[PDB]
Design a protein around this ligand. Structure first.
Ligand SMILES: O=P(O)(O)O[C@H]1[C@H](OP(=O)(O)O)[C@@H](OP(=O)(O)O)[C@H](OP(=O)(O)O)[C@@H](OP(=O)(O)O)[C@H]1OP(=O)(O)O
Ligand SMILES: [Zn+2]
Length: 384
RNA sequence: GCUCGCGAUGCUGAGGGCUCUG
RNA sequence: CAGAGCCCCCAGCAUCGCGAGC
């Protein structure tokens, strides 16, 4: 695991393996998938120290009509997005773990940080797997395997390169945000405005500035970055590195601990094959500790009986509130105070919100567009 | 090298249908 | 109620050509 290609091949093997174990060795009906993703944790360089944290599948996003004003629906079921949400549940569990008694502090991946709150114990790293290239910048210009003849991008200084791009409801393509400068509205989307969702290349880039942990968790922990991003197919390195960080090397004035993370980027030795079939309309998820995968309809953002996912906003907020009650005031990384409304609680994470603003400005100043958010009303709910 | 326009050939989440299945 | 196979269809990108601008 000291070598990059060995690591890359190992994380693919592990995520795939785990996916098999959870689906009756690849023969369960939920083994059917177009894209697989997961996260792996390494705690030191032995192959045995490596552990699968999460697994997911999916290729689709929510239909506009099914947005939840209560946070009960998954908005984006592209596999790598779901795999991050699944890792958030691990992070919550590992916080609780440390918090429940002194003995358990040995186990937990967190320790107290010398600057407040919590940080990862040294040599704890997470690695992202995607069985293909993330949509947007990393994918759109060469959405096929690389060919040994002319592998290099011939027009790297085109304006299209680096652009922020959106999944577009009912539309193919990943479309520049330039061309939808209007902000999105709740009443608009419901009537038929096509719901825009930032592309996966864009979101990963964002995680390489603001951390993978989100706003809420940053109230308790320091920023966590992916150390590797491994692709099982369609690896183009010049496009991938552009997309994941290099396009915003212009970024500045990040609050302390935040940075422009530049993870290992790799393909695998033997790429995955195009999976046969119509692309399934469900997304599967699993975090370590769960007894099974959870199956979500990507169009409703719910399971087949209309029940909310363990990974929905409301579920995550519920976790954040459990953990909040066990963290003494003096151990909070932010002591700024907000009402118990999901939107408001995220604003307590001042330094995260500031990093986020630096990100949005980096993209604008580089000529790459303005980030496109959900309608204001999405996050305006409380618990119960 | 890039931008704009015109053409041409392709690439990549929905919609309508037919056939069948549970 | 749900799924599959096959047909038809629907805003970016690639390649190449034409004209122009930087
Ligand atoms: O990429 P996803 O996993 O879909 O989720 C994110 C996440 O929202 P939740 O974690 O609440 O589901 C962001 O939250 P933080 O990074 O702040 O923790 C939120 O960003 P804002 O809170 O900054 O708005 C962003 O939403 P947005 O669409 O407003 O960028 C939203 O992504 P999606 O809406 O695309 O799911
Ligand atoms: Zn995607």
């Amino acid at each position: 695991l000291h070598l990059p290609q060995v690591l890359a091949d190992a994380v693919s093997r592990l995520v795939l393996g785990k996916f098999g174990d959870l689906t009756d060795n690849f023969s369960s009906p939920h083994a059917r998938r177009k894209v697989l993703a997961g996260v792996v944790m390494t705690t030191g360089t032995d192959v045995k120290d490596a552990k699968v944290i999460s697994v997911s599948t999916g290729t689709k996003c929510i239909n506009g009509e099914y947005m939840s004003d209560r946070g009960l629906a998954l908005n984006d079921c592209h596999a790598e997005i779901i795999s991050r949400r699944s890792l958030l549940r691990f992070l919550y569990t590992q916080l609780e773990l440390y918090l429940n008694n002194k003995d358990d502090q040995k186990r937990s991946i967190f320790q107290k940080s010398e600057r407040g709150g919590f940080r990862l114990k040294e040599n704890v790293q997470f690695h992202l797997y995607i069985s293909t290239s993330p949509c947007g910048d990393a994918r759109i210009f060469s959405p096929h395997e690389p060919i040994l003849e002319e592998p290099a991008d011939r027009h790297p200084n085109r304006k299209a390169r680096g652009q922020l791009r959106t999944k577009i409801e009912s539309g193919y393509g990943t479309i520049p945000v330039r061309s939808n400068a209007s902000i999105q509205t709740w009443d608009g989307v419901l009537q038929g405005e096509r719901l825009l969702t930032m592309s996966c290349s864009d979101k990963i880039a964002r995680w390489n500035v603001v951390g993978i942990q989100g706003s809420l968790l940053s109230i308790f922990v320091e920023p966590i970055y992916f150390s590797s991003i491994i692709l099982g197919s369609l690896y183009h390195g010049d496009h991938l590195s552009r997309a994941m960080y290099q396009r915003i090397s212009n970024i500045e004035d990040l609050p302390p601990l935040y940075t422009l993370n530049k993870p290992l980027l790799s393909g695998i030795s033997n790429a995955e094959a195009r999976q046969p079939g119509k692309a399934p309309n469900f997304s599967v998820n699993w975090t370590v500790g769960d007894s099974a995968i959870e199956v979500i309809n990507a169009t409703t953002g719910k399971d087949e009986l209309g029940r909310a996912s363990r990974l929905c906003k409301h579920a995550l907020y519920c976790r954040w509130m459990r953990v909040h009650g066990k963290v003494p005031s003096h151990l909070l990384r932010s002591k700024i105070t907000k009402p118990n409304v999901y939107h408001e609680s995220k604003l307590a994470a001042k330094e995260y919100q500031a990093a986020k603003a630096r990100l949005f400005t980096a993209f604008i100043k580089a000529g790459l567009g303005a980030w496109v958010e959900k309608p204001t009303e999405q996050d305006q709910f409380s618990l119960t």
